Nucleic acid binder design. Structure first.
Ligand SMILES: [Ca+2]
Ligand SMILES: [Ca+2]
Ligand SMILES: [Ca+2]
Ligand SMILES: [Cl-]
Lengths: 154, 151
RNA sequence: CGACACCUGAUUCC
DNA sequence: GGAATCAGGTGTCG
């Protein structure tokens, strides 16, 4: 199980097939290690978009971890939108009604709020991993996030 | 009706055993039975599918040059090379070669060199659906493999 | 404008 | 069931 000095490692990823198209199918994915018992591939409730799938993949992780009574983790992801939110954009947003830099409702509020609710007491070390750059951890989490939005066909 | 004016040529580029044990790509260009210019050498460089399939078009016309031929019909199954040369290049030339997604068009170095030889020359690209018609393809296609074997 | 993603479609190969 | 690669489009924020 990947660790990094008392910081248990974890990769997360979200996906949303047909994002911005008629019927969006979106799922969350979180990989803790090979054949690891915490590796989830859930489907994302409600709104179907990559952005929330992505930040919610991260929620699942934290949510999971707490249950495993782990307080500090190095959570990798390829979502800058999530990282930038959770560690910058949010703070501001709170002090001003969650209004975008163009003066309008911070769209993914509900999502970030949840996510921030969970950073509480946790010492997350948000790390970013490149796209299809070949990093296992991320590709296995990607793998998972799809099986989470599986078609149900077969 | 009308006369006749060009020469035909089939071209194929292949990339092997995906994994690591390998990734051998070969070029292969056919001009007809036993014809001298028929050749199927190995692809020099970053061994890949697309890339080979392109340079495999360079050699073609490049030899077309070494024959003072001014216009041919080039056959190929990859409409990446085709689309690339018949369209996406002018665009790439008017955008510092940026993928219609912000990043850099990887085979610029290739599509560049290719557009070079296209100079003065008049190529009429012909795409052929896999398992197309005309043995011509199965033949170039065959040298490719033979090429990929050389060191 | 920029940035990180999420896709849809194509063509070939095996 | 990918790897090659591209076009076109959304998700969202500075
Ligand atoms: Ca992602
Ligand atoms: Ca992904
Ligand atoms: Ca071929
Ligand atoms: Cl013929």
């Amino acid at each position: 199980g990947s660790h990094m000095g008392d910081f248990v490692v974890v990769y997360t990823d979200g996906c949303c097939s047909s994002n911005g198209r008629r019927r969006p199918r979106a799922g969350i994915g979180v990989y803790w290690g090979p054949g690891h018992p915490l590796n989830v591939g859930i489907r994302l409730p409600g709104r179907q978009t990559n952005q929330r799938a992505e930040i919610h993949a991260a929620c699942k992780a934290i949510e999971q971890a707490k249950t495993q009574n782990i307080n500090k983790l190095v959570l990798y992801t390829n979502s800058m939108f999530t990282i930038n939110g959770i560690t910058n954009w949010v703070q501001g947003w709170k002090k001003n009604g969650w209004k975008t830099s163009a003066g309008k409702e911070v769209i993914n509020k509900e999502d970030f709020v949840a996510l921030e609710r969970l950073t509480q007491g946790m010492d997350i070390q948000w790390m970013h991993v490149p796209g299809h750059s070949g990093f296992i951890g991320n590709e296995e989490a990607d793998r998972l996030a799809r099986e989470g939005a599986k078609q149900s066909e077969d």
